[PDB]
Design a protein around this ligand. Structure first.
Ligand SMILES: C[C@H](N)c1ccc(NC(=O)C2CC2)cc1
Ligand SMILES: [Cl-]
Ligand SMILES: [Zn+2]
Ligand SMILES: [Zn+2]
Length: 572
């Protein structure tokens, strides 16, 4: 409590000593409330290039509504039973060891962090305006040093969350989290090769092949239960099991990592704007409050742990979660040592998102440990058995399903897919404003090249992608604000051959493809089923008159070097 958070709280009061009021109509029951001060401050814009080249979608409500525009955060998960706590501690210990077998924890550097902000990544930050300026500035780094020495002392002053649910910190606090825990992401601890259940850095062009490899194992159905608000269901017990990564560390790193876990995770402080505008300073010891990248890695870890325990329950490794016997602890340990790795290989896990192919379908009704860890399944009654999938091409994972698509030469593509309304509606939105015509065009080109690489097998996206790349100057570089092989000025057929043939470990014959017409689509009915507008009069007019749309956008951007990509299609 206040011994660890006082300094942060005390500091904030003093900066707004001419506003501090301890309001008694504060909406908080779970969150600890400390005080309030005076504040007054705060949407998605449409990409006109993508929209002008996707006119049929102007009348599809699923597309157009995506561009318009709580009581989950203010909740508390109960303390798990003692047998649940033991299962979790034993499993967490074994899993950190397995992840650490071929990796060395290590500090991440200012140089690494500096290069990260100069290249623009979503670091979620807030004397300086841009984070680029601070990295260049040198007082900021003295500010970092002060906090750093404070962390070594066992104290914290400026590591405070701002809710808006995404929790931004000042860039200095992000540095210190990245210094301590950045190795998890930077050194690929959750790669499939090192974690077995993981998919970090794999790419959407690999996920479908990975699900198909899981399908090949003997077992029962494939289960893909989503958790109801995963971040809100992270217990202090989960935070303490995650902290055990510091047991693999040494020297300063160990102290710095212990400090982030103790001070910024296990005992948080947040400033939330309440319109009644006032800034409430509240605190809590549980729930997920980190950086989006460390959040990913620790969500993956705790999800792997929860799913191995659910598997153990389905195999009857333990009887009851209320209490674990000394023989049952022995059995859990022997299971992990004898089949732990095999059971990890039966899963694909990406943060909160999982697919499990258990040994058999007893897993479907193995609910006691899962419910008691507080990982309550979304949209199903607490004690109703999971509905599993019998076909790997039906299984949802990372917002996608995967099709098996056979090339005219017999080689097999496993391709990612989702409702086409979702793909078109996302490409039509630009995050933040201040965008030039050129920047908006380069974002449209990023979507177009992504569609050519991942969604080529959809007829409407190949056409629209060719149109947008025809409408945007040939040499303009794609921008943004997975592995992203579409972010390049190289020829998109050359990248396709590299990603789908040369570098594709499931493709034995490495014969290059010479043209886009060699590259197949879904079935006409599978395409429409997935949402193609084909067969519609509004769509055929768009395909027929596409050069007119292209020319409208060329006229707006002006007199530039353009390429006609439309003849890559045999029809044009
Ligand atoms: C080969 C090229 N990808 C292409 C172009 C248009 C269609 N559209 C249909 O077949 C609609 C009428 C039912 C199919 C394929
Ligand atoms: Cl199915
Ligand atoms: Zn701090
Ligand atoms: Zn599909």
């Amino acid at each position: 409590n206040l011994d660890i958070i006082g300094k942060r709280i005390e500091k904030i009061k003093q900066e707004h000593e001419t506003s501090w009021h301890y309001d008694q109509d504060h909406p908080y029951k779970t969150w600890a409330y400390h005080g309030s001060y005076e504040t007054k401050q705060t949407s998605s814009m449409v990409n006109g290039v993508v929209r002008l080249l996707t006119k049929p979608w102007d009348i599809i409500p699923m597309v157009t509504q995506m561009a318009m525009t709580k009581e989950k955060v203010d909740t508390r998960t109960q303390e798990p039973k003692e047998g649940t706590k033991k299962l979790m501690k034993i499993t967490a210990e074994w899993l950190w060891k397995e992840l650490g077998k071929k990796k060395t924890p290590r500090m991440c550097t200012r140089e690494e962090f500096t290069r990260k902000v100069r290249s623009n990544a979503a670091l979620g930050a807030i004397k300086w305006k841009s984070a680029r300026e601070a990295v260049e500035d040198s007082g900021f780094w003295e500010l970092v040093d002060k906090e750093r020495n404070l962390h070594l002392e066992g104290k914290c002053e400026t590591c405070v969350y701002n809710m808006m649910a995404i929790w931004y910190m000042w860039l200095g606090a992000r540095f210190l989290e990245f210094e301590a825990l950045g190795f998890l992401n930077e050194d690929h601890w959750f790669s499939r090769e090192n974690s077995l259940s993981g998919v970090e850095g794999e790419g959407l062009h690999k996920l479908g092949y990975i699900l198909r490899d899981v399908s090949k194992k003997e077992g029962g159905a494939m289960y893909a239960d989503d958790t109801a608000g995963w971040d809100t269901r992270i217990t202090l017990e989960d935070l303490k099991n995650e902290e055990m990564v510091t047991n693999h560390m040494e020297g300063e790193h160990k102290k710095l990592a212990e400090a982030i876990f103790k001070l910024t995770y296990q005992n948080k402080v947040v400033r939330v704007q309440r319109p009644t505008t006032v800034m409430d300073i509240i605190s809590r010891r549980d729930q997920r409050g980190s950086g989006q990248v460390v959040t990913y890695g620790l969500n993956t870890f705790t999800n792997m742990e929860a799913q191995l325990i659910r598997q153990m329950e389905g195999e009857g490794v333990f009887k009851s979660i209320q209490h674990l016997t000394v023989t049952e602890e022995i059995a859990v340990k022997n299971w992990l040592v004898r089949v732990g790795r095999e059971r990890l290989s039966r899963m694909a896990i990406s943060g909160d998102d999982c697919v499990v192919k258990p040994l058999d379908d007893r897993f479907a009704s193995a609910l006691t440990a899962l419910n008691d860890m507080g990982k309550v399944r979304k949209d199903i009654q607490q004690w109703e058995p999971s509905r599993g999938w019998n076909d790997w091409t039906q299984v949802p994972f990372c917002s996608h399903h995967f099709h098996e698509l056979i090339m005219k030469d017999g080689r097999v593509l496993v391709v990612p897919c989702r409702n086409q309304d979702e793909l078109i509606g996302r490409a039509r939105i630009s995050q933040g404003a201040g965008w030039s015509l050129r920047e908006t065009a380069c974002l449209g080109k990023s979507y177009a090249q992504m569609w050519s690489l991942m969604y080529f097998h959809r007829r409407d996206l190949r056409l629209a992608a060719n149109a947008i790349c025809s409408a945007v100057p040939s040499h303009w570089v794609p921008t943004s604000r997975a592995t992203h092989e579409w972010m390049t000025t190289e020829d998109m057929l050359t990248v396709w051959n590299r990603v789908w043939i040369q570098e594709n470990p499931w493709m034995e014959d490495k014969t290059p493809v010479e043209s886009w017409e060699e590259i197949p689509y879904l079935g006409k009915r599978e395409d429409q089923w997935c949402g193609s507008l084909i067969g519609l009069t509004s769509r055929a007019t768009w395909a027929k008159n596409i050069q007119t749309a292209i020319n409208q956008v060329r006229s707006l951007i002006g007199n530039e070097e353009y390429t006609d990509y439309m003849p890559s299609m045999k029809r044009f």
